Amino acid sequence: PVMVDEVVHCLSPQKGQIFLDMTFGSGGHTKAILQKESDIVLYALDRDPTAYALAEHLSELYPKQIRAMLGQFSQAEALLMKAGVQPGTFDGVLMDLGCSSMQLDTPERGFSLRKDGPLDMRMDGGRYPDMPTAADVVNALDQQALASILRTYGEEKHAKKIASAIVQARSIYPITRTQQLASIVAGAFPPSAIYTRKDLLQRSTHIATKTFQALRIFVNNELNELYTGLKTAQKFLRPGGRLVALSFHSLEDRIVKRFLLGISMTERFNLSVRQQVMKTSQLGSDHEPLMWELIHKKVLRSAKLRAAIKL
Ligand SMILES: C[S@@+](CC[C@H](N)C(=O)[O-])C[C@H]1O[C@@H](n2cnc3c(N)ncnc32)[C@H](O)[C@@H]1O
């Protein structure tokens, strides 16, 4: 788990306090919080069934403390209200964004470039069987739409040629597997551009990394989810409570940053139907009183920790 010591330090859990871990994952951070101070109450949320079941298991060892919840950031306000949690309650809220170890290390879920699997990439697992997969997306969207997703969400300078390769490839055989898609991405580049470039095979610099990241953000609606989750975090924090967020990508970091600065960002309800249908989101992009005390910004890894005290 990322920056566990710093997370627990920034949260500073004390006796009698109440916490929300919005990204329970494998439970790494929640367990570290409990080891620091066990006389707490902690709501453990995740959109992934696999993570939620680990939170339920943990609640069997810590029945006084843990309340496990299955849901998206966008569902968290409803979940908390139905659980009786009032606004202004939490001493701390944690958001460790992105993928869990379970999502990355289970080839069948289709998140990673190491091992081949179905091009699934849905964080919700089997919860929403009609939720579009990454395979659905690359097989259905026209060339301009795919290029826009890669450019906007992946910040992929080569979005057009990669999109062109995807559309050419799918006309031969549908794109259904992660390594199949990675090979298609690499195929967009002439040999002289990539020959003997071992970095383009390395874990975090793989030639298909940005493409996979763009598809993950789109498939899981991560930018709108994040903004909604941050607003919910602020509403349910009490004054003096701490928000701690870990970002790993330029767009989500910019969203957290602007949120903590009190800068307004795009609400979908303010976009015309045409805009919501035909354009990619500008959340986190360059040209899209005091509520916080900003108490930490630290980096390791793409990791960036931002912590703030609600005023
Ligand atoms: C980086 S892992 C968190 C790891 C965790 N802190 C630990 O120690 O194991 C991110 C988790 O947040 C969840 N997640 C990502 N976006 C979400 C969203 N919009 N709503 C609810 N859960 C989300 C993922 O399913 C994943 O389990």
Side-chain angles (χ1 to χ4, degrees), residues 41-62:
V41 168
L42 185 143
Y43 290 77
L45 176 77
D46 205 291
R47 68 194 284 180
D48 186 351
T50 298
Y52 158 71
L54 294 178
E56 290 282 35
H57 268 294
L58 191 65
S59 85
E60 286 291 297
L61 310 169
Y62 294 88

mmCIF file of all heavy atoms in Angstrom, residues 41-62:
data_model
loop_
_atom_site.group_PDB
_atom_site.id
_atom_site.type_symbol
_atom_site.label_atom_id
_atom_site.label_comp_id
_atom_site.label_asym_id
_atom_site.label_seq_id
_atom_site.Cartn_x
_atom_site.Cartn_y
_atom_site.Cartn_z
ATOM 1 N N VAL A 41 -14.356 4.217 14.660
ATOM 2 C CA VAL A 41 -15.344 3.672 13.737
ATOM 3 C C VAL A 41 -14.890 4.067 12.343
ATOM 4 O O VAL A 41 -14.512 5.224 12.123
ATOM 5 C CB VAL A 41 -16.757 4.199 14.037
ATOM 6 C CG1 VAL A 41 -17.713 3.857 12.911
ATOM 7 C CG2 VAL A 41 -17.263 3.638 15.374
ATOM 8 N N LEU A 42 -14.899 3.111 11.411
ATOM 9 C CA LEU A 42 -14.405 3.352 10.065
ATOM 10 C C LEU A 42 -15.361 2.728 9.057
ATOM 11 O O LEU A 42 -15.620 1.519 9.107
ATOM 12 C CB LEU A 42 -12.994 2.782 9.887
ATOM 13 C CG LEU A 42 -12.293 3.070 8.566
ATOM 14 C CD1 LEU A 42 -10.798 3.301 8.820
ATOM 15 C CD2 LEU A 42 -12.524 1.935 7.552
ATOM 16 N N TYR A 43 -15.891 3.558 8.164
ATOM 17 C CA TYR A 43 -16.675 3.098 7.028
ATOM 18 C C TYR A 43 -15.739 2.823 5.865
ATOM 19 O O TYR A 43 -14.942 3.695 5.485
ATOM 20 C CB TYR A 43 -17.729 4.134 6.636
ATOM 21 C CG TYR A 43 -18.830 4.232 7.677
ATOM 22 C CD1 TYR A 43 -18.631 4.911 8.876
ATOM 23 C CD2 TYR A 43 -20.055 3.613 7.472
ATOM 24 C CE1 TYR A 43 -19.640 4.977 9.836
ATOM 25 C CE2 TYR A 43 -21.063 3.680 8.416
ATOM 26 C CZ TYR A 43 -20.849 4.353 9.595
ATOM 27 O OH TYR A 43 -21.864 4.401 10.525
ATOM 28 N N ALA A 44 -15.835 1.611 5.314
ATOM 29 C CA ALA A 44 -14.925 1.123 4.280
ATOM 30 C C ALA A 44 -15.717 0.912 2.993
ATOM 31 O O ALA A 44 -16.525 -0.020 2.900
ATOM 32 C CB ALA A 44 -14.235 -0.169 4.727
ATOM 33 N N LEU A 45 -15.480 1.773 2.006
ATOM 34 C CA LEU A 45 -16.206 1.767 0.743
ATOM 35 C C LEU A 45 -15.315 1.293 -0.402
ATOM 36 O O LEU A 45 -14.115 1.596 -0.445
ATOM 37 C CB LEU A 45 -16.716 3.177 0.428
ATOM 38 C CG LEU A 45 -17.416 3.390 -0.916
ATOM 39 C CD1 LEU A 45 -18.842 2.841 -0.882
ATOM 40 C CD2 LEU A 45 -17.412 4.864 -1.293
ATOM 41 N N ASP A 46 -15.922 0.591 -1.364
ATOM 42 C CA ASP A 46 -15.239 0.298 -2.625
ATOM 43 C C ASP A 46 -16.298 -0.053 -3.658
ATOM 44 O O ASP A 46 -17.305 -0.675 -3.327
ATOM 45 C CB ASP A 46 -14.237 -0.853 -2.471
ATOM 46 C CG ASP A 46 -13.109 -0.805 -3.503
ATOM 47 O OD1 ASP A 46 -13.368 -1.030 -4.697
ATOM 48 O OD2 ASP A 46 -11.945 -0.563 -3.115
ATOM 49 N N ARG A 47 -16.060 0.321 -4.919
ATOM 50 C CA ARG A 47 -16.990 -0.102 -5.967
ATOM 51 C C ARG A 47 -16.759 -1.532 -6.419
ATOM 52 O O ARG A 47 -17.628 -2.105 -7.095
ATOM 53 C CB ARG A 47 -16.906 0.816 -7.191
ATOM 54 C CG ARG A 47 -15.581 0.708 -7.973
ATOM 55 C CD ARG A 47 -15.477 1.888 -8.944
ATOM 56 N NE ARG A 47 -16.328 1.733 -10.134
ATOM 57 C CZ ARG A 47 -16.404 2.637 -11.117
ATOM 58 N NH1 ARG A 47 -15.707 3.777 -11.046
ATOM 59 N NH2 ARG A 47 -17.187 2.417 -12.165
ATOM 60 N N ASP A 48 -15.629 -2.120 -6.055
ATOM 61 C CA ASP A 48 -15.277 -3.457 -6.525
ATOM 62 C C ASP A 48 -15.792 -4.516 -5.549
ATOM 63 O O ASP A 48 -15.361 -4.531 -4.389
ATOM 64 C CB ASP A 48 -13.762 -3.549 -6.682
ATOM 65 C CG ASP A 48 -13.306 -4.851 -7.308
ATOM 66 O OD1 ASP A 48 -14.121 -5.789 -7.488
ATOM 67 O OD2 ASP A 48 -12.103 -4.934 -7.613
ATOM 68 N N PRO A 49 -16.675 -5.434 -5.979
ATOM 69 C CA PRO A 49 -17.059 -6.568 -5.112
ATOM 70 C C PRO A 49 -15.905 -7.282 -4.429
ATOM 71 O O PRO A 49 -16.023 -7.675 -3.261
ATOM 72 C CB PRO A 49 -17.774 -7.514 -6.092
ATOM 73 C CG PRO A 49 -18.383 -6.574 -7.111
ATOM 74 C CD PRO A 49 -17.348 -5.482 -7.291
ATOM 75 N N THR A 50 -14.794 -7.486 -5.132
ATOM 76 C CA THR A 50 -13.666 -8.183 -4.522
ATOM 77 C C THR A 50 -13.124 -7.411 -3.323
ATOM 78 O O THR A 50 -12.829 -8.000 -2.278
ATOM 79 C CB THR A 50 -12.580 -8.408 -5.577
ATOM 80 O OG1 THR A 50 -13.123 -9.233 -6.617
ATOM 81 C CG2 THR A 50 -11.352 -9.084 -4.962
ATOM 82 N N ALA A 51 -12.994 -6.090 -3.448
ATOM 83 C CA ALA A 51 -12.523 -5.293 -2.316
ATOM 84 C C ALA A 51 -13.559 -5.245 -1.203
ATOM 85 O O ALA A 51 -13.215 -5.338 -0.019
ATOM 86 C CB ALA A 51 -12.188 -3.875 -2.778
ATOM 87 N N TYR A 52 -14.835 -5.080 -1.567
ATOM 88 C CA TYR A 52 -15.895 -5.018 -0.564
ATOM 89 C C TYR A 52 -15.936 -6.293 0.279
ATOM 90 O O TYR A 52 -16.142 -6.239 1.501
ATOM 91 C CB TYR A 52 -17.240 -4.756 -1.268
ATOM 92 C CG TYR A 52 -18.445 -5.191 -0.465
ATOM 93 C CD1 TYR A 52 -18.819 -4.494 0.685
ATOM 94 C CD2 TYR A 52 -19.196 -6.288 -0.839
ATOM 95 C CE1 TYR A 52 -19.913 -4.889 1.440
ATOM 96 C CE2 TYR A 52 -20.306 -6.695 -0.078
ATOM 97 C CZ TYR A 52 -20.649 -5.986 1.058
ATOM 98 O OH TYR A 52 -21.725 -6.367 1.844
ATOM 99 N N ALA A 53 -15.742 -7.460 -0.351
ATOM 100 C CA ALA A 53 -15.768 -8.696 0.437
ATOM 101 C C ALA A 53 -14.601 -8.758 1.421
ATOM 102 O O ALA A 53 -14.737 -9.329 2.511
ATOM 103 C CB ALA A 53 -15.754 -9.929 -0.477
ATOM 104 N N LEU A 54 -13.446 -8.191 1.060
ATOM 105 C CA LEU A 54 -12.359 -8.123 2.032
ATOM 106 C C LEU A 54 -12.730 -7.218 3.196
ATOM 107 O O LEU A 54 -12.404 -7.523 4.344
ATOM 108 C CB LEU A 54 -11.072 -7.637 1.362
ATOM 109 C CG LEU A 54 -10.469 -8.577 0.319
ATOM 110 C CD1 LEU A 54 -9.222 -7.924 -0.306
ATOM 111 C CD2 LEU A 54 -10.130 -9.921 0.952
ATOM 112 N N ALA A 55 -13.421 -6.109 2.917
ATOM 113 C CA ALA A 55 -13.892 -5.231 3.988
ATOM 114 C C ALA A 55 -14.901 -5.934 4.892
ATOM 115 O O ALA A 55 -14.881 -5.743 6.114
ATOM 116 C CB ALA A 55 -14.506 -3.958 3.402
ATOM 117 N N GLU A 56 -15.805 -6.738 4.315
ATOM 118 C CA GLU A 56 -16.728 -7.501 5.153
ATOM 119 C C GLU A 56 -15.978 -8.496 6.036
ATOM 120 O O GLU A 56 -16.291 -8.643 7.226
ATOM 121 C CB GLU A 56 -17.768 -8.230 4.289
ATOM 122 C CG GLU A 56 -18.795 -7.319 3.613
ATOM 123 C CD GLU A 56 -19.921 -6.834 4.551
ATOM 124 O OE1 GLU A 56 -19.682 -6.603 5.749
ATOM 125 O OE2 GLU A 56 -21.052 -6.643 4.066
ATOM 126 N N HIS A 57 -14.995 -9.206 5.468
ATOM 127 C CA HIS A 57 -14.169 -10.110 6.270
ATOM 128 C C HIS A 57 -13.507 -9.361 7.422
ATOM 129 O O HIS A 57 -13.522 -9.816 8.571
ATOM 130 C CB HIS A 57 -13.096 -10.760 5.395
ATOM 131 C CG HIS A 57 -13.508 -12.064 4.799
ATOM 132 N ND1 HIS A 57 -13.747 -13.186 5.560
ATOM 133 C CD2 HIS A 57 -13.726 -12.425 3.514
ATOM 134 C CE1 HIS A 57 -14.093 -14.186 4.769
ATOM 135 N NE2 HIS A 57 -14.089 -13.750 3.523
ATOM 136 N N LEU A 58 -12.919 -8.201 7.123
ATOM 137 C CA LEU A 58 -12.260 -7.427 8.163
ATOM 138 C C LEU A 58 -13.252 -7.024 9.246
ATOM 139 O O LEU A 58 -12.913 -7.008 10.437
ATOM 140 C CB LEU A 58 -11.585 -6.195 7.557
ATOM 141 C CG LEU A 58 -10.646 -5.448 8.518
ATOM 142 C CD1 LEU A 58 -9.456 -6.326 8.891
ATOM 143 C CD2 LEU A 58 -10.179 -4.117 7.919
ATOM 144 N N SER A 59 -14.499 -6.726 8.855
ATOM 145 C CA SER A 59 -15.530 -6.411 9.838
ATOM 146 C C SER A 59 -15.847 -7.582 10.763
ATOM 147 O O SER A 59 -16.399 -7.368 11.852
ATOM 148 C CB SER A 59 -16.800 -5.939 9.106
ATOM 149 O OG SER A 59 -17.611 -7.037 8.692
ATOM 150 N N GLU A 60 -15.514 -8.813 10.364
ATOM 151 C CA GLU A 60 -15.719 -9.937 11.274
ATOM 152 C C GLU A 60 -14.642 -9.989 12.348
ATOM 153 O O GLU A 60 -14.899 -10.468 13.461
ATOM 154 C CB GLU A 60 -15.763 -11.249 10.495
ATOM 155 C CG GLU A 60 -17.057 -11.420 9.721
ATOM 156 C CD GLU A 60 -18.229 -11.624 10.661
ATOM 157 O OE1 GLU A 60 -18.234 -12.631 11.391
ATOM 158 O OE2 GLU A 60 -19.139 -10.777 10.681
ATOM 159 N N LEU A 61 -13.439 -9.496 12.039
ATOM 160 C CA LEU A 61 -12.404 -9.374 13.059
ATOM 161 C C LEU A 61 -12.560 -8.091 13.864
ATOM 162 O O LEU A 61 -12.264 -8.075 15.060
ATOM 163 C CB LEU A 61 -11.007 -9.419 12.423
ATOM 164 C CG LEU A 61 -10.717 -10.561 11.441
ATOM 165 C CD1 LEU A 61 -9.408 -10.337 10.700
ATOM 166 C CD2 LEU A 61 -10.706 -11.903 12.148
ATOM 167 N N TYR A 62 -13.026 -7.011 13.240
ATOM 168 C CA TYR A 62 -13.233 -5.732 13.920
ATOM 169 C C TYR A 62 -14.709 -5.343 13.852
ATOM 170 O O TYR A 62 -15.068 -4.351 13.200
ATOM 171 C CB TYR A 62 -12.370 -4.639 13.296
ATOM 172 C CG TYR A 62 -10.878 -4.839 13.468
ATOM 173 C CD1 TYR A 62 -10.149 -5.576 12.545
ATOM 174 C CD2 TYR A 62 -10.201 -4.281 14.548
ATOM 175 C CE1 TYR A 62 -8.789 -5.755 12.687
ATOM 176 C CE2 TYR A 62 -8.838 -4.457 14.702
ATOM 177 C CZ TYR A 62 -8.135 -5.196 13.771
ATOM 178 O OH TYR A 62 -6.777 -5.374 13.919
#
